[PDB]
Sequence to fold (629 residues):
Amino acid sequence: VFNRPILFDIVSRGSTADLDGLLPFLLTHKKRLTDEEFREPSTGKTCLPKALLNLSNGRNDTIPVLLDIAERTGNMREFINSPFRDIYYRGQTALHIAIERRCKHYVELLVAQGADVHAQARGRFFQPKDEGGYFYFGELPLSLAACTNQPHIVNYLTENPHKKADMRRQDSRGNTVLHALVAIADNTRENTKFVTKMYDLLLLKCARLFPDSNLEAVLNNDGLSPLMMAAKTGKIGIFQHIIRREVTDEDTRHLSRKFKDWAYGPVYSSLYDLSSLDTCGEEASVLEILVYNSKIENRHEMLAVEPINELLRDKWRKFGAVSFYINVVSYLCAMVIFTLTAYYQPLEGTPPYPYRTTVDYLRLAGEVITLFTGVLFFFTNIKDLFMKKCPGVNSLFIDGSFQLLYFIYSVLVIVSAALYLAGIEAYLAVMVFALVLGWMNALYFTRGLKLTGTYSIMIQKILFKDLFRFLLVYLLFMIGYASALVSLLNPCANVPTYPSCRDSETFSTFLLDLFKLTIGMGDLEMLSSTKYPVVFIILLVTYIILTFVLLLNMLIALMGETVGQVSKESKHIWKLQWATTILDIERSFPVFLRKAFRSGEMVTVGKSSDGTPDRRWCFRVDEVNWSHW
Ligand SMILES: CCCCCC/C=C/CCCCCCCC(=O)O[C@H](COC(=O)CCCCCCCCCCC/C=C/CCCCCCCC)COP(=O)(O)OCC[N+](C)(C)C
Ligand SMILES: CCCCCC/C=C/CCCCCCCC(=O)O[C@H](COC(=O)CCCCCCCCCCC/C=C\CCCCCCCC)COP(=O)(O)OCC[N+](C)(C)C
Ligand SMILES: CCCCCC/C=C\CCCCCCCC(=O)O[C@H](COC(=O)CCCCCCCCCCC/C=C/CCCCCCCC)COP(=O)(O)OCC[N+](C)(C)C
Ligand SMILES: CCCCCC/C=C\CCCCCCCC(=O)O[C@H](COC(=O)CCCCCCCCCCC/C=C\CCCCCCCC)COP(=O)(O)OCC[N+](C)(C)C
Ligand SMILES: CCCCCC/C=C\CCCCCCCC(=O)O[C@H](COC(=O)CCCCCCCCCCC/C=C\CCCCCCCC)COP(=O)(O)OCC[N+](C)(C)C
Ligand SMILES: CCCCCC/C=C\CCCCCCCC(=O)O[C@H](COC(=O)CCCCCCCCCCC/C=C\CCCCCCCC)COP(=O)(O)OCC[N+](C)(C)C
Ligand code: NA
Ligand code: NA
Ligand code: NA
Fold:
């Protein structure tokens, strides 16, 4: 009487008259609605989803009857429970459907008959957008009701009688509800609004219950707490909210991270918590994550909030500034040594060993100190291979460029050291590149000043955004004219001249003359020994006009558009450069020394478990407003 296609129509039509009678029919033939040959073959869908998906106007009275029929078959447990085994819906239930439809009335229902509030909606649809999915919310009904802007459900699901989803439950990634609100928060007004509300709500609510470990401390299956998870994913609205979190009510004051130490008229101190932000070695920290492992698109807005700017500046005072200016002179000196050993390197004979002299032994100190730097920069970069390397480090203006060139410098000293010992006399040519490359690595050390460091950033952008597109065209013209102009010179199959005849080097030198010529550095000085002399002169003039008057002076113009556009952007990169410099120094210290330079002051912010105080390191920031008396 009721086949598979029969019912899915009836319930999809949502009219509880045509279905009546399937109750006694099914009871007789020894069936239960969940049975295989009554539910869809592809997904695994049954009557109850199809009712809810095709819900209309907010209600549909088929469902209380199909559920009334459920206990008659005795499948309520199995009936409001089902893994759609579709590889796009691996775990969706009627409760996942009840909530996303904003259908409060049935969400109260479906849980009341004791269904589930923990089903892991693990389907590829229900994965993050980078796994090839559409909507991650966690994987749970409570994590959904939060992530779908439904406060009423979320309140209910907790303080509902029958069953309740604890606010602690982890999905199949470790991520709880707060982890999941960080996964769906974009940095828009409307999104950041209702994320922060519910984030607080559950966090303040979960303090009432389980008056123990904060739910914000629940690490997921890669550690990263909701704050650490926002810092890695670039979510300012939640990230900013968490740090300057000042709750006042006596119970939930351990949840605040911005205190009110003292005030006196229009001057107001304040005291931020650095529990996660600054952890010298013995914990993961937000600040390491931002400066190294995060979204580069907004990392400057992350390092420009409440302690983070003044916490790095404080490290710069203590050790950051000093140790950086030992690194520079240590490097500038090492390049003096690599210079003097090159100006006193001999130039006659296969390997110029024959030292046996106070000078040549002094040169020997030079090459050895050099090779020490090359093997150093080689290992420190390959240490970074098993450590901080493998982002897209080929064109970043945040030390991605120099990691290569110090590696090139490192390789290129090793090869010269290999050939100076393997007899080969091109130790020199390979060294010469290493030397020019090495001084051009001292631009790394312009990072300790906005003045010189912003400048060095504009050099490299202009080198990318402005100079390559210029050489593409410039080259393209040059082979065009040069070939065109070589064609108009008589061979030396004629009288052995270059300045009248052409043979075997005439192309190559023109490329240099036509290079000197556009640079404003060579003279025409018409060759004039040509079959057609007047066509020749007409072409060089078109080369000057196009390449000097028009391309190279347009190149100045384009730079002016570049430096105007990338000035601010270069100020913001430098702040990432500068911060990266500080932590590269800090990480290079032992832990006890990092704790000696520990930034902030220990404070009893308040009282906690059995009167135990809160010994939270914090960072004072005095402030003035002549407005909020
Ligand atoms: C977008 C426009 C592109 C223009 C491209 C240039 C075009 C030129 C078109 C005309 C072709 C001329 C052909 C010359 C042929 C040639 O060479 O014939 C010769 C000798 O010479 C003549 O007989 C011509 C005498 C007249 C001279 C005055 C020219 C006035 C030119 C005015 C216009 C200048 C444009 C200037 C550049 C402006 C560019 C601005 C935009 C920027 C983008 C490019 C071969 O001698 P032969 O007897 O075989 O043997 C040698 C014996 N002997 C003669 C030396 C005793
Ligand atoms: C407002 C405050 C104003 C104060 C301003 C003046 C401050 C001056 C501080 C100067 C000291 C810091 C610089 C030292 C040199 C340094 O650290 O050089 C670093 C590395 O060094 C080392 O590896 C050597 C290890 C030993 C260092 C400490 C020795 C000095 C100890 C004295 C500290 C003074 C305080 C306490 C006492 C210590 C005892 C325990 C506490 C007791 C209670 C107080 C250079 O960087 P590098 O790794 O090359 O850069 C990155 C390299 N990479 C990874 C990219 C390849
Ligand atoms: C990932 C990097 C690794 C590099 C790979 C290259 C390594 C090794 C190759 C070297 C060996 C090849 C020659 C072996 C045979 C030989 O010795 O051949 C010689 C001549 O050979 C050469 O001259 C080879 C050219 C060397 C330079 C290569 C490029 C070096 C690296 C280039 C990159 C660095 C630049 C940067 C530019 C700066 C601007 C950037 C700004 C960027 C700003 C952002 C024959 O002459 P002969 O007198 O007979 O020699 C004596 C022989 N006898 C008689 C004793 C047996
Ligand atoms: C308050 C002051 C206290 C002073 C304490 C002095 C303590 C110790 C002195 C020795 C310091 C050595 C520290 C080296 C730290 C280091 O690792 O340095 C490296 C730099 O490469 C080296 O060092 C090469 C190695 C060979 C030794 C140096 C040359 C030979 C010895 C010279 C020492 C004596 C100097 C100068 C003497 C004349 C001074 C005139 C003052 C005048 C003041 C105005 C830091 O590069 P990195 O950050 O890792 O960046 C790499 C790039 N990447 C990967 C991050 C992109
Ligand atoms: C390459 C490695 C890394 C290098 C980094 C350090 C480089 C240089 C050190 C310079 C430090 C001082 C500059 C601070 C400027 C500043 O902080 O602000 C600048 C203001 O600049 C100036 O007014 C003029 C600047 C030029 C002064 C010249 C004297 C210093 C050099 C020493 C003398 C050299 C001669 C001769 C030597 C003797 C020879 C005898 C042997 C001869 C052979 C026998 C911009 O301010 P603003 O517009 O607010 O922009 C924002 C920047 N802000 C404040 C946030 C950082
Ligand atoms: C994608 C296609 C790439 C194809 C590349 C094919 C490469 C080579 C083919 C040539 C093979 C022969 C060369 C042997 C080398 C040699 O030794 O040749 C010499 C010839 O003399 C020279 O001085 C060398 C002149 C070289 C000509 C280059 C032409 C133009 C090449 C253009 C390549 C660039 C493309 C594009 C630029 C894009 C720009 C925008 C960005 C777009 C990005 C996609 C042999 O001397 P010999 O005969 O013994 O004596 C001299 C002659 N005499 C006296 C007997 C009459
Ligand atoms: Na000129
Ligand atoms: Na000249
Ligand atoms: Na001249």
Q: What stands out?
A: The two ends are 77 Å apart (CA to CA).
